[PDB]
Design an enzyme around this catalytic site. Structure first.
Site, PDB file in Angstrom:
ATOM      1  N   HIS A   1      -1.090  -8.742   8.056  1.00 47.25           N
ATOM      2  CA  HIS A   1      -0.617  -9.733   7.084  1.00 47.25           C
ATOM      3  C   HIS A   1       0.834 -10.123   7.326  1.00 47.25           C
ATOM      4  O   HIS A   1       1.275 -11.159   6.817  1.00 47.25           O
ATOM      5  CB  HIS A   1      -0.859  -9.251   5.630  1.00 47.25           C
ATOM      6  CG  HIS A   1       0.131  -8.251   5.112  1.00 47.25           C
ATOM      7  ND1 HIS A   1      -0.136  -6.898   5.070  1.00 47.25           N
ATOM      8  CD2 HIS A   1       1.349  -8.410   4.539  1.00 47.25           C
ATOM      9  CE1 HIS A   1       0.901  -6.263   4.554  1.00 47.25           C
ATOM     10  NE2 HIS A   1       1.816  -7.158   4.221  1.00 47.25           N
TER      11      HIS A   1
ATOM     12  N   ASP B   1      -6.067  -4.387   8.282  1.00 49.48           N
ATOM     13  CA  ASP B   1      -4.731  -4.982   8.145  1.00 49.48           C
ATOM     14  C   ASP B   1      -3.766  -4.442   9.192  1.00 49.48           C
ATOM     15  O   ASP B   1      -2.596  -4.181   8.893  1.00 49.48           O
ATOM     16  CB  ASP B   1      -4.158  -4.776   6.743  1.00 49.48           C
ATOM     17  CG  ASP B   1      -2.952  -5.649   6.473  1.00 49.48           C
ATOM     18  OD1 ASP B   1      -2.747  -6.637   7.212  1.00 49.48           O
ATOM     19  OD2 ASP B   1      -2.204  -5.371   5.500  1.00 49.48           O
TER      20      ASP B   1
ATOM     21  N   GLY C   1       8.661  -5.745   1.922  1.00 54.49           N
ATOM     22  CA  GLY C   1       9.265  -5.782   3.240  1.00 54.49           C
ATOM     23  C   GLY C   1       9.158  -4.496   4.028  1.00 54.49           C
ATOM     24  O   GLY C   1       9.718  -4.410   5.132  1.00 54.49           O
TER      25      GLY C   1
ATOM     26  N   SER D   1       6.022  -2.925   4.574  1.00 60.23           N
ATOM     27  CA  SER D   1       4.738  -2.792   5.246  1.00 60.23           C
ATOM     28  C   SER D   1       4.981  -2.616   6.739  1.00 60.23           C
ATOM     29  O   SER D   1       5.905  -3.205   7.308  1.00 60.23           O
ATOM     30  CB  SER D   1       3.851  -4.007   4.981  1.00 60.23           C
ATOM     31  OG  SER D   1       4.308  -5.135   5.687  1.00 60.23           O
TER      32      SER D   1
HETATM   33  C1  ZJV Z   1      -4.007 -12.320   6.227  1.00 58.16           C
HETATM   34  O1  ZJV Z   1      -4.984 -11.428   6.677  1.00 58.16           O
HETATM   35  C2  ZJV Z   1      -4.987 -10.221   5.986  1.00 58.16           C
HETATM   36  C3  ZJV Z   1      -5.875  -9.069   6.453  1.00 58.16           C
HETATM   37  C4  ZJV Z   1      -5.876  -7.762   5.688  1.00 58.16           C
HETATM   38  C5  ZJV Z   1      -4.971  -7.610   4.437  1.00 58.16           C
HETATM   39  N1  ZJV Z   1      -4.975  -6.338   3.715  1.00 58.16           N
HETATM   40  C6  ZJV Z   1      -4.132  -6.197   2.552  1.00 58.16           C
HETATM   41  C7  ZJV Z   1      -4.099  -4.883   1.764  1.00 58.16           C
HETATM   42  C8  ZJV Z   1      -3.236  -7.354   2.095  1.00 58.16           C
HETATM   43  O2  ZJV Z   1      -2.438  -7.118   0.977  1.00 58.16           O
HETATM   44  C9  ZJV Z   1      -1.520  -8.098   0.796  1.00 58.16           C
HETATM   45  C10 ZJV Z   1      -0.154  -7.929   1.523  1.00 58.16           C
HETATM   46  C11 ZJV Z   1       0.216  -6.790   1.074  1.00 58.16           C
HETATM   47  C12 ZJV Z   1       1.725  -6.435   0.797  1.00 58.16           C
HETATM   48  O3  ZJV Z   1       2.430  -7.019   0.014  1.00 58.16           O
HETATM   49  N2  ZJV Z   1       2.184  -5.277   1.533  1.00 58.16           N
HETATM   50  C13 ZJV Z   1       3.480  -4.610   1.403  1.00 58.16           C
HETATM   51  C14 ZJV Z   1       4.653  -5.375   1.983  1.00 58.16           C
HETATM   52  O4  ZJV Z   1       5.785  -4.986   1.939  1.00 58.16           O
HETATM   53  N3  ZJV Z   1       4.334  -6.600   2.659  1.00 58.16           N
HETATM   54  S1  ZJV Z   1       5.681  -7.376   3.278  1.00 58.16           S
HETATM   55  O5  ZJV Z   1       6.404  -6.588   4.289  1.00 58.16           O
HETATM   56  O6  ZJV Z   1       6.618  -7.720   2.203  1.00 58.16           O
HETATM   57  C15 ZJV Z   1       5.020  -8.920   3.952  1.00 58.16           C
HETATM   58  C16 ZJV Z   1       4.247  -9.869   2.999  1.00 58.16           C
HETATM   59  C17 ZJV Z   1       5.882  -9.569   5.028  1.00 58.16           C
HETATM   60  C18 ZJV Z   1       4.567  -8.868   5.416  1.00 58.16           C
HETATM   61  C19 ZJV Z   1       3.844  -3.155   1.111  1.00 58.16           C
HETATM   62  C20 ZJV Z   1       3.836  -4.181  -0.038  1.00 58.16           C
HETATM   63  C21 ZJV Z   1       5.099  -4.163  -0.946  1.00 58.16           C
HETATM   64  C22 ZJV Z   1       5.109  -4.640  -2.208  1.00 58.16           C
HETATM   65  C23 ZJV Z   1       3.838  -5.224  -2.859  1.00 58.16           C
HETATM   66  C24 ZJV Z   1       4.191  -6.569  -3.535  1.00 58.16           C
HETATM   67  C25 ZJV Z   1       3.002  -7.143  -4.352  1.00 58.16           C
HETATM   68  C26 ZJV Z   1       1.713  -7.247  -3.477  1.00 58.16           C
HETATM   69  C27 ZJV Z   1       0.755  -6.097  -3.905  1.00 58.16           C
HETATM   70  C28 ZJV Z   1      -0.479  -6.027  -2.986  1.00 58.16           C
HETATM   71  N4  ZJV Z   1      -1.303  -4.976  -3.487  1.00 58.16           N
HETATM   72  C29 ZJV Z   1      -2.613  -4.790  -2.887  1.00 58.16           C
HETATM   73  O7  ZJV Z   1      -3.068  -5.627  -2.168  1.00 58.16           O
HETATM   74  O8  ZJV Z   1      -3.279  -3.597  -3.235  1.00 58.16           O
HETATM   75  C30 ZJV Z   1      -4.613  -3.451  -2.837  1.00 58.16           C
HETATM   76  C31 ZJV Z   1      -4.849  -2.096  -2.188  1.00 58.16           C
HETATM   77  C32 ZJV Z   1      -5.430  -3.575  -4.128  1.00 58.16           C
HETATM   78  F1  ZJV Z   1      -5.290  -4.843  -4.605  1.00 58.16           F
HETATM   79  F2  ZJV Z   1      -6.730  -3.267  -3.869  1.00 58.16           F
HETATM   80  F3  ZJV Z   1      -4.971  -2.727  -5.086  1.00 58.16           F
HETATM   81  C33 ZJV Z   1       0.010  -5.797  -1.549  1.00 58.16           C
HETATM   82  O9  ZJV Z   1       0.666  -4.822  -1.294  1.00 58.16           O
HETATM   83  N5  ZJV Z   1      -0.310  -6.800  -0.500  1.00 58.16           N
HETATM   84  C34 ZJV Z   1      -1.019  -7.918  -0.655  1.00 58.16           C
HETATM   85  N6  ZJV Z   1      -3.224  -8.616   2.811  1.00 58.16           N
HETATM   86  C35 ZJV Z   1      -4.091  -8.745   3.986  1.00 58.16           C
HETATM   87  C36 ZJV Z   1      -4.088 -10.073   4.751  1.00 58.16           C
END
Ligand code: ZJV
Ligand code: ZN
Length: 198
Positions: A76, A100, A156, A158
């Site tokens: 992602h 992911d 930020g 992940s």
């Molecule tokens: C596009 O193709 C795909 C294929 C597989 C995917 N697989 C997942 C998993 C996913 O998830 C999304 C992104 C992720 C996220 O945000 N990651 C962190 C992060 O820092 N990213 S980042 O660096 O800022 C960034 C965006 C620059 C890269 C660690 C978070 C920190 C804070 C979280 C902020 C609020 C978002 C909450 C959300 N919660 C969640 O989804 O919980 C799941 C388990 C649930 F819902 F079931 F409970 C979540 O964490 N994300 C929502 N997108 C996918 C997309």
């Protein structure tokens, strides 16, 4: 039209989390201007060091972690993008949207974490601000924060590692579970699922 079709830039290493000493701290190695240029060319001549890199695209920033000779991050954040290197863009060697997860060959000069075989549930999440956050493992791919905090503090991060007490890699941070904006738990790709992918 085909003539004007654009190409997405490479992921670029813009810093690292220094875990060398007794104090963890983030270091920046490239500013935004150089990051934008390096993303377009895919040519990054900066020396790489350490296990946890801070990486950026044109629109996102996140982390990437070297385990067993592969630099791992989240799909992602990186999508299918190449990563910049001294000799130009490097194509992903692992891509799994269902986990992911993406990976490239570890950059020359990086150090790799060792996959954990301790079977311990007392983990530590490393963030892009070099916070070392205790996490209790709660399942194959999840763990609870011992001290919850707003999701803002995890955004930020992940692609960062969850580590065991011995400093081995247990997984790659991918998502945060929150209630009223408070992160109470995290989800991660377990190292065995990477070792499976490998
Ligand atoms: C596009 O193709 C795909 C294929 C597989 C995917 N697989 C997942 C998993 C996913 O998830 C999304 C992104 C992720 C996220 O945000 N990651 C962190 C992060 O820092 N990213 S980042 O660096 O800022 C960034 C965006 C620059 C890269 C660690 C978070 C920190 C804070 C979280 C902020 C609020 C978002 C909450 C959300 N919660 C969640 O989804 O919980 C799941 C388990 C649930 F819902 F079931 F409970 C979540 O964490 N994300 C929502 N997108 C996918 C997309
Ligand atoms: Zn271990």
């Amino acid at each position: 039209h085909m003539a004007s079709m654009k190409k997405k830039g490479s992921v670029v290493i813009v810093g690292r989390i220094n875990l060398s000493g007794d104090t963890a701290y983030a270091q920046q190695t490239r500013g935004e201007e150089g990051c934008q240029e390096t993303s377009q060319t895919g040519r990054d001549k900066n020396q790489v060091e350490g296990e946890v890199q801070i990486v950026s695209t044109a629109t996102q920033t996140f982390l990437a972690t070297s385990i067993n000779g592969v630099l791992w991050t989240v799909y992602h954040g990186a999508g299918t993008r190449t990563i910049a290197s001294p000799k130009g863009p490097v194509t992903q060697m692992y891509t799994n949207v269902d986990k992911d997860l993406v990976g490239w060959q570890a950059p020359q000069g990086s150090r790799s974490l060792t996959p954990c075989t301790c079977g311990s549930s007392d983990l530590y999440l490393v963030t892009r601000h070099a916070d070392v956050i205790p996490v209790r493992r709660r399942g194959d791919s999840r763990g609870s924060l011992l001290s919850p905090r707003p999701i803002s503090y995890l955004k930020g991060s992940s692609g960062g590692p969850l580590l065991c007490p011995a400093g081995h890699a247990v997984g790659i941070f991918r998502a945060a579970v929150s209630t009223r904006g408070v992160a109470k738990a995290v989800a991660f790709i377990p190292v065995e699922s990477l070792e499976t992918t490998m």
